[PDB]
PDB file of C-alpha atoms and ligand atoms in Angstrom:
ATOM      1  CA  UNK A   1      34.839 -81.626  43.946  1.00 23.13           C
ATOM      2  CA  UNK A   2      37.473 -78.893  43.607  1.00 22.45           C
ATOM      3  CA  UNK A   3      37.062 -77.652  47.176  1.00 23.22           C
ATOM      4  CA  UNK A   4      39.612 -76.817  49.856  1.00 21.85           C
ATOM      5  CA  UNK A   5      39.767 -79.469  52.610  1.00 17.68           C
ATOM      6  CA  UNK A   6      38.386 -79.211  56.108  1.00 19.20           C
ATOM      7  CA  UNK A   7      41.153 -77.778  58.283  1.00 17.17           C
ATOM      8  CA  UNK A   8      42.616 -75.553  55.552  1.00 17.88           C
ATOM      9  CA  UNK A   9      43.681 -72.204  57.029  1.00 16.30           C
ATOM     10  CA  UNK A  10      43.561 -68.564  55.903  1.00 18.05           C
ATOM     11  CA  UNK A  11      45.417 -67.076  58.883  1.00 20.91           C
ATOM     12  CA  UNK A  12      42.701 -66.973  61.586  1.00 18.82           C
ATOM     13  CA  UNK A  13      40.069 -68.591  59.327  1.00 18.58           C
ATOM     14  CA  UNK A  14      39.675 -72.366  59.132  1.00 19.60           C
ATOM     15  CA  UNK A  15      37.644 -74.156  56.467  1.00 18.22           C
ATOM     16  CA  UNK A  16      35.103 -76.532  58.000  1.00 17.19           C
ATOM     17  CA  UNK A  17      33.048 -77.833  55.082  1.00 15.33           C
ATOM     18  CA  UNK A  18      32.318 -77.075  51.447  1.00 15.45           C
ATOM     19  CA  UNK A  19      28.562 -76.468  51.579  1.00 17.99           C
ATOM     20  CA  UNK A  20      27.944 -75.200  48.057  1.00 16.10           C
ATOM     21  CA  UNK A  21      29.780 -75.920  44.820  1.00 17.23           C
ATOM     22  CA  UNK A  22      28.610 -74.558  41.490  1.00 18.05           C
ATOM     23  CA  UNK A  23      30.292 -73.882  38.192  1.00 17.15           C
ATOM     24  CA  UNK A  24      31.517 -70.451  39.289  1.00 15.94           C
ATOM     25  CA  UNK A  25      32.418 -70.601  42.959  1.00 17.06           C
ATOM     26  CA  UNK A  26      32.558 -72.676  46.106  1.00 16.87           C
ATOM     27  CA  UNK A  27      30.925 -71.729  49.407  1.00 18.49           C
ATOM     28  CA  UNK A  28      32.440 -72.985  52.671  1.00 21.25           C
ATOM     29  CA  UNK A  29      31.365 -73.026  56.256  1.00 19.03           C
ATOM     30  CA  UNK A  30      34.426 -71.643  58.043  1.00 20.50           C
ATOM     31  CA  UNK A  31      35.458 -70.504  61.487  1.00 16.99           C
ATOM     32  CA  UNK A  32      37.168 -67.317  62.644  1.00 16.82           C
ATOM     33  CA  UNK A  33      39.491 -68.298  65.504  1.00 15.41           C
ATOM     34  CA  UNK A  34      40.124 -64.655  66.414  1.00 12.50           C
ATOM     35  CA  UNK A  35      36.470 -63.660  66.887  1.00 13.49           C
ATOM     36  CA  UNK A  36      35.359 -67.254  67.644  1.00 12.79           C
ATOM     37  CA  UNK A  37      32.478 -67.207  65.198  1.00 15.02           C
ATOM     38  CA  UNK A  38      31.269 -69.264  62.277  1.00 15.98           C
ATOM     39  CA  UNK A  39      31.352 -67.472  58.926  1.00 18.46           C
ATOM     40  CA  UNK A  40      30.957 -68.374  55.281  1.00 19.42           C
ATOM     41  CA  UNK A  41      33.725 -68.020  52.717  1.00 17.23           C
ATOM     42  CA  UNK A  42      32.930 -67.765  49.031  1.00 17.10           C
ATOM     43  CA  UNK A  43      35.782 -68.690  46.678  1.00 14.94           C
ATOM     44  CA  UNK A  44      35.722 -67.572  43.052  1.00 14.53           C
ATOM     45  CA  UNK A  45      36.255 -70.742  41.002  1.00 12.99           C
ATOM     46  CA  UNK A  46      35.001 -70.856  37.428  1.00 15.39           C
ATOM     47  CA  UNK A  47      35.404 -74.551  36.606  1.00 14.24           C
ATOM     48  CA  UNK A  48      35.252 -74.002  32.841  1.00 14.34           C
ATOM     49  CA  UNK A  49      38.269 -71.682  33.096  1.00 13.62           C
ATOM     50  CA  UNK A  50      40.336 -72.933  36.019  1.00 12.61           C
ATOM     51  CA  UNK A  51      41.421 -76.005  37.981  1.00 11.47           C
ATOM     52  CA  UNK A  52      42.764 -76.764  41.458  1.00 11.20           C
ATOM     53  CA  UNK A  53      46.566 -77.079  41.596  1.00 10.48           C
ATOM     54  CA  UNK A  54      48.407 -79.526  43.852  1.00 13.21           C
ATOM     55  CA  UNK A  55      49.238 -76.779  46.350  1.00 10.91           C
ATOM     56  CA  UNK A  56      45.490 -75.872  46.276  1.00 11.10           C
ATOM     57  CA  UNK A  57      45.962 -72.630  44.382  1.00  9.83           C
ATOM     58  CA  UNK A  58      43.895 -72.075  41.231  1.00 13.52           C
ATOM     59  CA  UNK A  59      45.387 -72.180  37.733  1.00 13.14           C
ATOM     60  CA  UNK A  60      44.033 -71.658  34.240  1.00 11.88           C
ATOM     61  CA  UNK A  61      42.860 -74.755  32.355  1.00 15.15           C
ATOM     62  CA  UNK A  62      44.117 -73.046  29.209  1.00 12.96           C
ATOM     63  CA  UNK A  63      46.152 -69.930  28.618  1.00 15.33           C
ATOM     64  CA  UNK A  64      43.408 -68.602  26.329  1.00 12.06           C
ATOM     65  CA  UNK A  65      41.087 -68.290  29.364  1.00 13.54           C
ATOM     66  CA  UNK A  66      43.164 -65.672  31.213  1.00 11.13           C
ATOM     67  CA  UNK A  67      41.321 -62.521  30.129  1.00 12.61           C
ATOM     68  CA  UNK A  68      37.892 -64.025  30.803  1.00 13.22           C
ATOM     69  CA  UNK A  69      39.073 -65.396  34.154  1.00 11.58           C
ATOM     70  CA  UNK A  70      40.327 -61.964  35.226  1.00 10.46           C
ATOM     71  CA  UNK A  71      37.120 -60.257  34.098  1.00 11.21           C
ATOM     72  CA  UNK A  72      35.104 -62.737  36.141  1.00 10.85           C
ATOM     73  CA  UNK A  73      37.384 -62.069  39.097  1.00 14.36           C
ATOM     74  CA  UNK A  74      36.930 -58.320  38.674  1.00 15.60           C
ATOM     75  CA  UNK A  75      33.156 -58.780  38.600  1.00 12.86           C
ATOM     76  CA  UNK A  76      33.364 -60.910  41.749  1.00 11.93           C
ATOM     77  CA  UNK A  77      35.225 -58.040  43.464  1.00  8.87           C
ATOM     78  CA  UNK A  78      32.677 -55.497  42.249  1.00 11.12           C
ATOM     79  CA  UNK A  79      29.823 -57.640  43.573  1.00 13.68           C
ATOM     80  CA  UNK A  80      31.496 -57.862  46.991  1.00 13.58           C
ATOM     81  CA  UNK A  81      31.826 -54.071  46.981  1.00 11.40           C
ATOM     82  CA  UNK A  82      28.136 -53.663  46.129  1.00  8.57           C
ATOM     83  CA  UNK A  83      27.067 -55.995  48.918  1.00  8.14           C
ATOM     84  CA  UNK A  84      29.457 -54.187  51.265  1.00  9.42           C
ATOM     85  CA  UNK A  85      27.312 -51.046  50.864  1.00  7.43           C
ATOM     86  CA  UNK A  86      24.475 -52.551  52.907  1.00 10.06           C
ATOM     87  CA  UNK A  87      23.809 -53.605  56.504  1.00  9.42           C
ATOM     88  CA  UNK A  88      20.408 -55.267  56.165  1.00 12.81           C
ATOM     89  CA  UNK A  89      19.172 -58.592  57.575  1.00 13.70           C
ATOM     90  CA  UNK A  90      17.902 -59.696  54.167  1.00 14.07           C
ATOM     91  CA  UNK A  91      21.094 -58.995  52.210  1.00 15.85           C
ATOM     92  CA  UNK A  92      24.255 -61.114  52.407  1.00 16.10           C
ATOM     93  CA  UNK A  93      26.513 -59.296  54.859  1.00 18.43           C
ATOM     94  CA  UNK A  94      30.099 -59.053  53.665  1.00 18.14           C
ATOM     95  CA  UNK A  95      32.655 -59.413  56.312  1.00 17.00           C
ATOM     96  CA  UNK A  96      35.902 -60.219  54.585  1.00 16.83           C
ATOM     97  CA  UNK A  97      37.532 -59.830  51.097  1.00 17.06           C
ATOM     98  CA  UNK A  98      41.024 -60.854  49.977  1.00 17.42           C
ATOM     99  CA  UNK A  99      42.996 -62.297  47.077  1.00 17.55           C
ATOM    100  CA  UNK A 100      45.023 -65.493  47.526  1.00 17.28           C
ATOM    101  CA  UNK A 101      45.684 -68.793  45.726  1.00 18.92           C
ATOM    102  CA  UNK A 102      45.330 -67.098  42.337  1.00 18.49           C
ATOM    103  CA  UNK A 103      41.716 -66.229  43.054  1.00 16.06           C
ATOM    104  CA  UNK A 104      39.568 -64.178  45.437  1.00 16.49           C
ATOM    105  CA  UNK A 105      37.625 -64.806  48.642  1.00 18.65           C
ATOM    106  CA  UNK A 106      34.648 -63.160  50.327  1.00 16.29           C
ATOM    107  CA  UNK A 107      34.151 -63.756  54.031  1.00 17.71           C
ATOM    108  CA  UNK A 108      30.486 -63.273  54.891  1.00 16.19           C
ATOM    109  CA  UNK A 109      27.975 -63.804  57.619  1.00 15.92           C
ATOM    110  CA  UNK A 110      26.950 -67.452  57.890  1.00 11.60           C
ATOM    111  CA  UNK A 111      23.258 -68.129  57.314  1.00 12.14           C
ATOM    112  CA  UNK A 112      21.286 -71.128  58.515  1.00 12.44           C
ATOM    113  CA  UNK A 113      18.788 -72.986  56.372  1.00 12.84           C
ATOM    114  CA  UNK A 114      18.919 -73.678  52.656  1.00 14.92           C
ATOM    115  CA  UNK A 115      18.046 -72.036  49.353  1.00 17.84           C
ATOM    116  CA  UNK A 116      14.458 -71.499  48.329  1.00 17.33           C
ATOM    117  CA  UNK A 117      15.150 -73.795  45.369  1.00 18.26           C
ATOM    118  CA  UNK A 118      16.121 -76.631  47.722  1.00 18.78           C
ATOM    119  CA  UNK A 119      13.206 -75.962  50.080  1.00 17.83           C
ATOM    120  CA  UNK A 120      10.763 -76.072  47.173  1.00 17.93           C
ATOM    121  CA  UNK A 121      12.295 -79.362  46.016  1.00 21.10           C
ATOM    122  CA  UNK A 122      12.513 -81.014  49.453  1.00 19.31           C
ATOM    123  CA  UNK A 123       9.536 -79.624  51.427  1.00 20.27           C
ATOM    124  CA  UNK A 124       7.019 -78.240  48.906  1.00 16.47           C
ATOM    125  CA  UNK A 125       4.249 -78.997  51.437  1.00 15.68           C
ATOM    126  CA  UNK A 126       5.581 -76.176  53.644  1.00 16.32           C
ATOM    127  CA  UNK A 127       4.987 -73.630  50.865  1.00 15.42           C
ATOM    128  CA  UNK A 128       1.411 -72.367  51.024  1.00 15.99           C
ATOM    129  CA  UNK A 129      -0.212 -68.949  50.805  1.00 18.65           C
ATOM    130  CA  UNK A 130       0.278 -68.161  54.497  1.00 18.64           C
ATOM    131  CA  UNK A 131       3.984 -69.007  54.257  1.00 20.56           C
ATOM    132  CA  UNK A 132       4.353 -66.909  51.099  1.00 16.53           C
ATOM    133  CA  UNK A 133       2.644 -63.938  52.728  1.00 15.43           C
ATOM    134  CA  UNK A 134       5.093 -64.196  55.640  1.00 14.92           C
ATOM    135  CA  UNK A 135       8.035 -64.415  53.219  1.00 14.83           C
ATOM    136  CA  UNK A 136       7.140 -61.348  51.239  1.00 12.71           C
ATOM    137  CA  UNK A 137       7.561 -58.424  53.713  1.00 12.56           C
ATOM    138  CA  UNK A 138      11.231 -59.215  54.469  1.00 13.41           C
ATOM    139  CA  UNK A 139      11.917 -60.177  50.836  1.00 12.52           C
ATOM    140  CA  UNK A 140      10.298 -56.937  49.650  1.00 16.01           C
ATOM    141  CA  UNK A 141      12.374 -55.029  52.186  1.00 14.15           C
ATOM    142  CA  UNK A 142      15.625 -56.570  50.979  1.00 12.93           C
ATOM    143  CA  UNK A 143      14.952 -55.916  47.285  1.00 10.97           C
ATOM    144  CA  UNK A 144      13.675 -52.398  47.968  1.00 11.89           C
ATOM    145  CA  UNK A 145      16.844 -51.586  49.917  1.00 12.45           C
ATOM    146  CA  UNK A 146      18.902 -52.351  46.790  1.00 13.09           C
ATOM    147  CA  UNK A 147      16.603 -50.211  44.697  1.00 12.47           C
ATOM    148  CA  UNK A 148      16.608 -47.280  47.069  1.00 11.15           C
ATOM    149  CA  UNK A 149      20.362 -46.953  46.781  1.00 12.45           C
ATOM    150  CA  UNK A 150      20.139 -46.865  42.968  1.00 12.65           C
ATOM    151  CA  UNK A 151      20.956 -50.433  42.086  1.00 14.70           C
ATOM    152  CA  UNK A 152      19.136 -53.389  40.567  1.00 14.97           C
ATOM    153  CA  UNK A 153      19.529 -57.068  41.413  1.00 13.30           C
ATOM    154  CA  UNK A 154      18.890 -58.512  37.904  1.00 16.76           C
ATOM    155  CA  UNK A 155      19.493 -62.166  38.826  1.00 16.31           C
ATOM    156  CA  UNK A 156      16.556 -63.096  41.082  1.00 17.91           C
ATOM    157  CA  UNK A 157      15.372 -66.713  41.066  1.00 16.94           C
ATOM    158  CA  UNK A 158      14.882 -69.418  43.689  1.00 18.68           C
ATOM    159  CA  UNK A 159      18.531 -70.438  43.536  1.00 20.53           C
ATOM    160  CA  UNK A 160      19.953 -67.351  45.291  1.00 19.35           C
ATOM    161  CA  UNK A 161      17.366 -66.675  48.005  1.00 21.52           C
ATOM    162  CA  UNK A 162      18.317 -68.288  51.304  1.00 19.99           C
ATOM    163  CA  UNK A 163      15.517 -69.388  53.639  1.00 18.69           C
ATOM    164  CA  UNK A 164      16.921 -69.418  57.170  1.00 16.63           C
ATOM    165  CA  UNK A 165      15.639 -71.688  59.922  1.00 14.45           C
ATOM    166  CA  UNK A 166      13.728 -68.604  61.143  1.00 10.27           C
ATOM    167  CA  UNK A 167      12.161 -68.670  57.614  1.00  9.92           C
ATOM    168  CA  UNK A 168      13.555 -65.167  57.008  1.00  7.32           C
ATOM    169  CA  UNK A 169      15.008 -64.693  53.502  1.00  9.12           C
ATOM    170  CA  UNK A 170      18.485 -63.532  52.491  1.00  7.56           C
ATOM    171  CA  UNK A 171      19.586 -62.446  49.010  1.00  8.85           C
ATOM    172  CA  UNK A 172      22.895 -64.276  48.546  1.00  9.53           C
ATOM    173  CA  UNK A 173      24.301 -63.466  45.166  1.00  7.94           C
ATOM    174  CA  UNK A 174      23.809 -61.321  42.047  1.00 11.22           C
ATOM    175  CA  UNK A 175      25.590 -63.700  39.682  1.00 11.04           C
ATOM    176  CA  UNK A 176      27.979 -60.956  38.586  1.00 11.36           C
ATOM    177  CA  UNK A 177      31.035 -63.115  37.802  1.00  8.46           C
ATOM    178  CA  UNK A 178      28.951 -65.815  36.102  1.00  9.14           C
ATOM    179  CA  UNK A 179      27.155 -63.256  33.961  1.00 10.93           C
ATOM    180  CA  UNK A 180      30.342 -61.456  32.970  1.00 11.41           C
ATOM    181  CA  UNK A 181      32.013 -64.742  32.005  1.00  7.24           C
ATOM    182  CA  UNK A 182      28.949 -65.713  29.994  1.00  7.28           C
ATOM    183  CA  UNK A 183      28.861 -62.404  28.141  1.00  8.33           C
ATOM    184  CA  UNK A 184      32.572 -62.483  27.288  1.00  7.58           C
ATOM    185  CA  UNK A 185      32.523 -66.161  26.298  1.00  7.57           C
ATOM    186  CA  UNK A 186      29.293 -66.040  24.244  1.00  4.73           C
ATOM    187  CA  UNK A 187      27.904 -68.618  26.685  1.00  8.24           C
ATOM    188  CA  UNK A 188      24.629 -66.723  26.636  1.00  7.04           C
ATOM    189  CA  UNK A 189      22.919 -69.563  28.521  1.00  7.67           C
ATOM    190  CA  UNK A 190      24.559 -68.554  31.840  1.00  9.12           C
ATOM    191  CA  UNK A 191      23.676 -64.856  31.610  1.00 10.55           C
ATOM    192  CA  UNK A 192      19.898 -64.584  31.969  1.00 11.83           C
ATOM    193  CA  UNK A 193      17.649 -67.035  33.794  1.00 12.66           C
ATOM    194  CA  UNK A 194      14.951 -68.411  31.449  1.00 14.26           C
ATOM    195  CA  UNK A 195      11.464 -67.663  32.710  1.00 16.63           C
ATOM    196  CA  UNK A 196      12.721 -65.223  35.361  1.00 18.45           C
ATOM    197  CA  UNK A 197      14.286 -62.557  33.110  1.00 18.61           C
ATOM    198  CA  UNK A 198      11.740 -60.098  31.649  1.00 16.99           C
ATOM    199  CA  UNK A 199      11.786 -58.936  28.048  1.00 15.07           C
ATOM    200  CA  UNK A 200      13.809 -55.751  28.651  1.00 13.64           C
ATOM    201  CA  UNK A 201      16.789 -57.746  29.949  1.00 10.68           C
ATOM    202  CA  UNK A 202      17.259 -59.470  26.579  1.00  8.28           C
ATOM    203  CA  UNK A 203      18.371 -56.063  25.040  1.00  8.78           C
ATOM    204  CA  UNK A 204      14.436 -49.575  30.096  1.00  4.75           C
ATOM    205  CA  UNK A 205      15.580 -51.592  33.104  1.00  6.15           C
ATOM    206  CA  UNK A 206      14.522 -50.541  36.588  1.00  3.16           C
ATOM    207  CA  UNK A 207      12.761 -51.829  39.710  1.00  5.40           C
ATOM    208  CA  UNK A 208      10.087 -53.431  37.483  1.00  3.96           C
ATOM    209  CA  UNK A 209      12.836 -55.720  36.100  1.00  2.61           C
ATOM    210  CA  UNK A 210      13.352 -57.259  39.538  1.00  3.34           C
ATOM    211  CA  UNK A 211       9.618 -57.235  40.217  1.00  3.29           C
ATOM    212  CA  UNK A 212       9.034 -59.493  37.206  1.00  4.05           C
ATOM    213  CA  UNK A 213      11.627 -62.002  38.428  1.00  7.08           C
ATOM    214  CA  UNK A 214      10.016 -61.966  41.875  1.00  5.22           C
ATOM    215  CA  UNK A 215       6.688 -62.654  40.192  1.00  6.34           C
ATOM    216  CA  UNK A 216       8.359 -65.573  38.430  1.00  7.63           C
ATOM    217  CA  UNK A 217       9.668 -66.869  41.772  1.00  5.40           C
ATOM    218  CA  UNK A 218       6.181 -66.658  43.264  1.00  6.25           C
ATOM    219  CA  UNK A 219       4.681 -68.353  40.198  1.00  8.52           C
ATOM    220  CA  UNK A 220       7.186 -71.187  40.654  1.00  9.74           C
ATOM    221  CA  UNK A 221       6.246 -71.590  44.328  1.00  7.13           C
ATOM    222  CA  UNK A 222       2.534 -71.662  43.558  1.00  7.22           C
ATOM    223  CA  UNK A 223       2.331 -73.940  40.496  1.00  2.00           C
ATOM    224  CA  UNK A 224       5.789 -75.507  40.544  1.00  2.00           C
ATOM    225  CA  UNK A 225       7.508 -74.039  37.473  1.00  2.00           C
ATOM    226  CA  UNK A 226       8.338 -70.555  36.166  1.00  2.00           C
ATOM    227  CA  UNK A 227       6.267 -68.791  33.502  1.00  2.00           C
ATOM    228  CA  UNK A 228       7.136 -69.023  29.799  1.00  2.00           C
ATOM    229  CA  UNK A 229      10.370 -67.430  28.617  1.00  2.00           C
ATOM    230  CA  UNK A 230       9.674 -63.713  28.200  1.00  2.00           C
ATOM    231  CA  UNK A 231      10.971 -63.508  24.620  1.00  4.79           C
ATOM    232  CA  UNK A 232       8.584 -66.285  23.621  1.00  9.94           C
ATOM    233  CA  UNK A 233       5.800 -64.369  25.389  1.00  8.46           C
ATOM    234  CA  UNK A 234       6.672 -61.207  23.428  1.00  5.40           C
ATOM    235  CA  UNK A 235       5.903 -63.027  20.165  1.00  5.00           C
ATOM    236  CA  UNK A 236       2.816 -64.918  21.315  1.00  4.84           C
ATOM    237  CA  UNK A 237       1.888 -64.703  24.995  1.00  5.18           C
ATOM    238  CA  UNK A 238       0.872 -68.159  26.208  1.00  7.34           C
ATOM    239  CA  UNK A 239       0.998 -67.127  29.878  1.00  9.07           C
ATOM    240  CA  UNK A 240      -2.170 -68.290  31.594  1.00  7.16           C
ATOM    241  CA  UNK A 241      -3.040 -65.876  34.435  1.00  4.12           C
ATOM    242  CA  UNK A 242      -3.016 -67.554  37.813  1.00  3.95           C
ATOM    243  CA  UNK A 243      -6.389 -65.931  38.480  1.00  3.54           C
ATOM    244  CA  UNK A 244      -7.785 -68.135  35.683  1.00  2.62           C
ATOM    245  CA  UNK A 245      -5.799 -71.278  36.551  1.00  6.93           C
ATOM    246  CA  UNK A 246      -7.015 -71.041  40.158  1.00  2.74           C
ATOM    247  CA  UNK A 247      -4.478 -73.314  41.896  1.00  2.00           C
ATOM    248  CA  UNK A 248      -6.043 -74.828  45.001  1.00  3.49           C
ATOM    249  CA  UNK A 249      -5.540 -72.944  48.239  1.00  2.67           C
ATOM    250  CA  UNK A 250      -4.596 -69.572  46.714  1.00  2.00           C
ATOM    251  CA  UNK A 251      -6.564 -66.330  46.972  1.00  2.00           C
ATOM    252  CA  UNK A 252      -7.385 -64.145  43.966  1.00  2.00           C
ATOM    253  CA  UNK A 253      -5.526 -61.347  45.738  1.00  2.00           C
ATOM    254  CA  UNK A 254      -2.168 -63.149  45.843  1.00  2.00           C
ATOM    255  CA  UNK A 255      -2.686 -64.666  42.394  1.00  2.00           C
ATOM    256  CA  UNK A 256      -3.482 -61.252  40.890  1.00  2.00           C
ATOM    257  CA  UNK A 257      -0.342 -59.793  42.501  1.00  2.00           C
ATOM    258  CA  UNK A 258       1.770 -62.435  40.770  1.00  2.00           C
ATOM    259  CA  UNK A 259       0.035 -61.891  37.421  1.00  2.00           C
ATOM    260  CA  UNK A 260       0.622 -58.128  37.623  1.00  2.00           C
ATOM    261  CA  UNK A 261       4.304 -58.586  38.490  1.00  2.00           C
ATOM    262  CA  UNK A 262       4.496 -60.828  35.402  1.00  2.00           C
ATOM    263  CA  UNK A 263       2.957 -58.288  33.032  1.00  2.00           C
ATOM    264  CA  UNK A 264       4.860 -58.597  29.767  1.00  2.00           C
ATOM    265  CA  UNK A 265       5.681 -54.907  29.324  1.00  2.00           C
ATOM    266  CA  UNK A 266       7.554 -52.980  32.057  1.00  2.00           C
ATOM    267  CA  UNK A 267       4.994 -50.172  32.175  1.00  2.00           C
ATOM    268  CA  UNK A 268       2.177 -52.615  32.990  1.00  2.00           C
ATOM    269  CA  UNK A 269       3.904 -53.989  36.114  1.00  2.00           C
ATOM    270  CA  UNK A 270       4.105 -52.529  39.604  1.00  2.00           C
ATOM    271  CA  UNK A 271       6.747 -49.823  39.265  1.00  2.00           C
ATOM    272  CA  UNK A 272       8.231 -50.095  42.770  1.00  2.00           C
ATOM    273  CA  UNK A 273       8.399 -52.770  45.432  1.00  2.00           C
ATOM    274  CA  UNK A 274       6.007 -50.654  47.528  1.00  2.00           C
ATOM    275  CA  UNK A 275       3.510 -50.697  44.637  1.00  2.00           C
ATOM    276  CA  UNK A 276       3.651 -54.485  44.469  1.00  3.22           C
ATOM    277  CA  UNK A 277       3.245 -54.856  48.242  1.00  3.81           C
ATOM    278  CA  UNK A 278       0.190 -52.597  48.162  1.00  6.96           C
ATOM    279  CA  UNK A 279      -1.451 -55.117  45.805  1.00  5.50           C
ATOM    280  CA  UNK A 280      -1.555 -57.654  48.598  1.00  4.19           C
ATOM    281  CA  UNK A 281      -3.609 -55.356  50.706  1.00  2.00           C
ATOM    282  CA  UNK A 282      -7.396 -54.702  50.860  1.00  2.00           C
ATOM    283  CA  UNK A 283      -8.212 -58.240  51.868  1.00  2.00           C
TER     284      UNK A 283
HETATM  285  N1  ADP B 301      26.614 -66.858  53.525  1.00  2.00           N
HETATM  286  C1  ADP B 301      26.104 -68.113  53.466  1.00  2.00           C
HETATM  287  N2  ADP B 301      25.772 -68.809  54.580  1.00  2.00           N
HETATM  288  C2  ADP B 301      25.264 -70.057  54.487  1.00  2.00           C
HETATM  289  N3  ADP B 301      25.042 -70.714  53.326  1.00  2.00           N
HETATM  290  C3  ADP B 301      25.346 -70.131  52.139  1.00  2.00           C
HETATM  291  C4  ADP B 301      25.904 -68.767  52.151  1.00  2.00           C
HETATM  292  N4  ADP B 301      26.116 -68.428  50.868  1.00  2.00           N
HETATM  293  C5  ADP B 301      25.729 -69.478  50.098  1.00  2.00           C
HETATM  294  N5  ADP B 301      25.265 -70.493  50.853  1.00  2.00           N
HETATM  295  C6  ADP B 301      24.787 -71.814  50.350  1.00  2.00           C
HETATM  296  O1  ADP B 301      25.667 -72.273  49.314  1.00  2.00           O
HETATM  297  C7  ADP B 301      24.970 -73.183  48.452  1.00  2.00           C
HETATM  298  C8  ADP B 301      25.412 -73.034  46.990  1.00  2.00           C
HETATM  299  O2  ADP B 301      25.064 -74.059  46.028  1.00  2.00           O
HETATM  300  P1  ADP B 301      24.467 -75.567  46.197  1.00  2.00           P
HETATM  301  O3  ADP B 301      23.410 -75.753  45.129  1.00  2.00           O
HETATM  302  O4  ADP B 301      24.126 -75.886  47.635  1.00  2.00           O
HETATM  303  O5  ADP B 301      25.727 -76.505  45.791  1.00  2.00           O
HETATM  304  P2  ADP B 301      25.806 -78.103  46.072  1.00  2.00           P
HETATM  305  O6  ADP B 301      25.264 -78.760  44.821  1.00  2.00           O
HETATM  306  O7  ADP B 301      27.276 -78.355  46.309  1.00  2.00           O
HETATM  307  O8  ADP B 301      24.952 -78.351  47.295  1.00  2.00           O
HETATM  308  C9  ADP B 301      23.488 -72.913  48.666  1.00  2.00           C
HETATM  309  O9  ADP B 301      22.866 -74.130  49.096  1.00  2.00           O
HETATM  310  C10 ADP B 301      23.389 -71.849  49.754  1.00  2.00           C
HETATM  311  O10 ADP B 301      22.421 -72.201  50.752  1.00  2.00           O
END
């Protein structure tokens, strides 16, 4: 682990535990001693570019990585600014942003629970149609709020949807820094998410781009894995509609909603979140 230790201080903030560590940042449970509340802190930390120094600042692993490191940092800042536009229960709420230690930090609201990816791995028996139909209204609302302000998410999968103990979802992360680093470094494999990214993301984008990825999330919850990579589908579509697979315990109405979200071409999908939600009605 490259994480700051428990007890580390940023003025009034104290690190309590590193609770998430990926290749591009570290998430900490932390405590604000001024406001006496638990928060999360997200630290930009691209491990392929940078390492932890003895004084716990961040330094480049090689001088050739400086431009890509700074571009990732700039994208991290821009993502914090985008999230700072919203005050919505289903979108990560940005409290704090600052630069220190050669990197950058976002202080955010602390959310209970775990990611949808971890819930699906640990308690797949909890995920049934009734649970999915309770998940969708707040998840729809969160995505639609992004869309209504003129933005797209473009990185939806199970990994960046938090499921709180209340079961309410939170969108945590748009992958901006990761995706910028991948584009600049020709590490294409960290830019799009195979099976979740629709065809128009591989090089025309709009709400239907996020709707496809949400369809792919739902497909993963229902049958356990995402649909085929969209570029492979565009050559020869081996996607088997869920209405034909008929997984046990799932209604044609929900299965058809997933299939429509996963329509290969953008124009054949629901065009807005509201359109997709309307598909779940009439039953
Ligand atoms: N604002 C937040 N509040 C609470 N948890 C968060 C917040 N932002 C991110 N997380 C958590 O950070 C984790 C990031 O990656 P994860 O896969 O857990 O790494 P690790 O392999 O170290 O467990 C996720 O589990 C997610 O639940």
